[PDB]
Design a protein around this motif. Sequence first.
Motif, mmCIF file in Angstrom:
data_model
loop_
_atom_site.group_PDB
_atom_site.id
_atom_site.type_symbol
_atom_site.label_atom_id
_atom_site.label_comp_id
_atom_site.label_asym_id
_atom_site.label_seq_id
_atom_site.Cartn_x
_atom_site.Cartn_y
_atom_site.Cartn_z
ATOM 1 N N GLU A 76 0.938 -1.276 -0.063
ATOM 2 C CA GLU A 76 0.011 0.050 0.051
ATOM 3 C C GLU A 76 0.778 1.241 0.076
ATOM 4 O O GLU A 76 0.587 2.228 -0.695
ATOM 5 N N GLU A 77 2.051 1.278 0.678
ATOM 6 C CA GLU A 77 2.985 2.344 0.497
ATOM 7 C C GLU A 77 3.394 2.457 -0.626
ATOM 8 O O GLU A 77 3.207 3.720 -1.426
ATOM 9 N N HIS A 78 3.763 1.691 -1.476
ATOM 10 C CA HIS A 78 4.268 1.595 -3.027
ATOM 11 C C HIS A 78 3.068 2.336 -3.759
ATOM 12 O O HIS A 78 3.375 2.926 -4.807
ATOM 13 N N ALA A 79 1.955 1.520 -3.708
ATOM 14 C CA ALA A 79 0.681 1.873 -4.394
ATOM 15 C C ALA A 79 0.211 3.547 -4.379
ATOM 16 O O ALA A 79 0.413 3.930 -5.272
ATOM 17 N N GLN A 80 0.263 3.984 -3.088
ATOM 18 C CA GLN A 80 -0.042 5.386 -2.872
ATOM 19 C C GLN A 80 1.079 6.272 -3.386
ATOM 20 O O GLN A 80 0.792 7.471 -3.969
ATOM 21 N N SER A 81 2.348 5.887 -3.356
ATOM 22 C CA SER A 81 3.521 6.663 -3.787
ATOM 23 C C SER A 81 3.054 7.266 -5.128
ATOM 24 O O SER A 81 3.546 8.480 -5.496
ATOM 25 N N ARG A 82 2.202 6.192 -6.026
ATOM 26 C CA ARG A 82 1.945 6.811 -7.627
ATOM 27 C C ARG A 82 1.121 7.816 -7.581
ATOM 28 O O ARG A 82 0.965 8.527 -8.676
ATOM 29 N N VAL A 83 0.169 8.032 -6.728
ATOM 30 C CA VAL A 83 -0.848 9.152 -6.444
ATOM 31 C C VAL A 83 -0.019 10.340 -6.070
ATOM 32 O O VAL A 83 -0.102 11.290 -6.885
ATOM 33 N N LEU A 84 0.619 10.017 -4.937
ATOM 34 C CA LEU A 84 1.490 11.297 -4.375
ATOM 35 C C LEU A 84 2.397 11.941 -5.578
ATOM 36 O O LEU A 84 2.612 12.991 -5.453
ATOM 37 N N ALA A 85 2.784 10.870 -6.371
ATOM 38 C CA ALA A 85 3.903 11.158 -7.631
ATOM 39 C C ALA A 85 2.923 11.542 -8.943
ATOM 40 O O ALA A 85 3.439 12.495 -9.429
ATOM 41 N N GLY A 86 1.553 11.628 -8.876
ATOM 42 C CA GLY A 86 0.712 12.304 -9.850
ATOM 43 C C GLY A 86 0.585 11.847 -11.186
ATOM 44 O O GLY A 86 0.219 12.144 -12.085
ATOM 45 N N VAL A 87 1.090 10.206 -11.190
ATOM 46 C CA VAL A 87 1.188 9.556 -12.373
ATOM 47 C C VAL A 87 -0.263 8.351 -12.651
ATOM 48 O O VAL A 87 -0.359 7.631 -13.512
ATOM 49 N N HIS A 88 -0.779 8.397 -11.626
ATOM 50 C CA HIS A 88 -1.886 7.306 -11.232
ATOM 51 C C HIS A 88 -3.025 8.101 -10.404
ATOM 52 O O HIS A 88 -3.006 8.619 -9.479
ATOM 53 N N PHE A 89 -4.432 7.672 -10.707
ATOM 54 C CA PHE A 89 -5.522 8.008 -10.019
ATOM 55 C C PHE A 89 -5.952 6.884 -8.808
ATOM 56 O O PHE A 89 -5.541 5.735 -9.045
ATOM 57 N N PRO A 90 -6.549 7.064 -7.899
ATOM 58 C CA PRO A 90 -6.867 6.002 -6.881
ATOM 59 C C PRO A 90 -7.484 4.816 -7.595
ATOM 60 O O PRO A 90 -7.321 3.914 -7.380
ATOM 61 N N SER A 91 -8.420 5.131 -8.675
ATOM 62 C CA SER A 91 -9.161 4.101 -9.129
ATOM 63 C C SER A 91 -8.098 3.167 -10.036
ATOM 64 O O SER A 91 -8.414 1.918 -10.025
ATOM 65 N N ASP A 92 -6.912 3.836 -10.485
ATOM 66 C CA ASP A 92 -5.890 3.069 -10.932
ATOM 67 C C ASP A 92 -5.156 1.967 -9.907
ATOM 68 O O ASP A 92 -4.907 0.902 -10.443
ATOM 69 N N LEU A 93 -5.244 2.540 -8.720
ATOM 70 C CA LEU A 93 -4.317 1.462 -7.751
ATOM 71 C C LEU A 93 -5.294 0.419 -7.667
ATOM 72 O O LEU A 93 -5.018 -0.553 -7.242
ATOM 73 N N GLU A 94 -6.772 0.556 -7.482
ATOM 74 C CA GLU A 94 -7.986 -0.160 -7.165
ATOM 75 C C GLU A 94 -7.729 -1.386 -8.333
ATOM 76 O O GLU A 94 -7.826 -2.476 -8.114
#
Length: 212
Positions: free
Chosen positions: A156-174
């Motif tokens: 989950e740390e790695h997943a959120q890092s991509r939102v914080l980074a601005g390359v992915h939407f929460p729904s992309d993580l889902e």
Amino acid sequence: AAPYPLAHPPRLADYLPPPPAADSAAAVADLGAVLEAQRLRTPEQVRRVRAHDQWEDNVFPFAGDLLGASFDKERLPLTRSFFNRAQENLVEVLMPAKKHFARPRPYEVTPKVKPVLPPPEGESYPSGHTMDSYFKASLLSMLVPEHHDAFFARAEEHAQSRVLAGVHFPSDLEGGQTAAAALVASLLADPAVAADFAAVREELRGALGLPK
């Protein structure tokens, strides 16, 4: 390293919903969440996420601080092989899915989004990084159930890092989360793969001196 010769890998499009439609309430929350993360992110958070994550033996950096110094790439040939080969199986099902759903990236919906990882062109859904993260946590948790939560909190740390980074939407993580499960189940159903994995179990548990 070569993928396992899966006979019928999963077509991820059959396993995932579409991403939010551009006009939907979901699409507005998605962008909201990405913009809120941009506001809140610190220069040190930004530096840490830009640290180069090499892809070859990436399970070692992922769980080294969780498992001991015994978790040695150079002392676990079977583990190191299994994870590099399955990584490439991950990439084989992920490319078609990205291309299929063709989701615009956050920074292609508005230029307000200033990504800090080198920004790819479209193909935002699902997040392959999130898929790979939950994929490793799923396999590692099967091998070492004793650290299940530590592996899944790291995913989950790695997943959120991509939102914080601005390359992915929460729904992309889902979508990456769901995909990882379909791959793990598909892959471990192959009996030659199940056998290599049973061997990884003995190497790894052995090296960490755990029982059963």
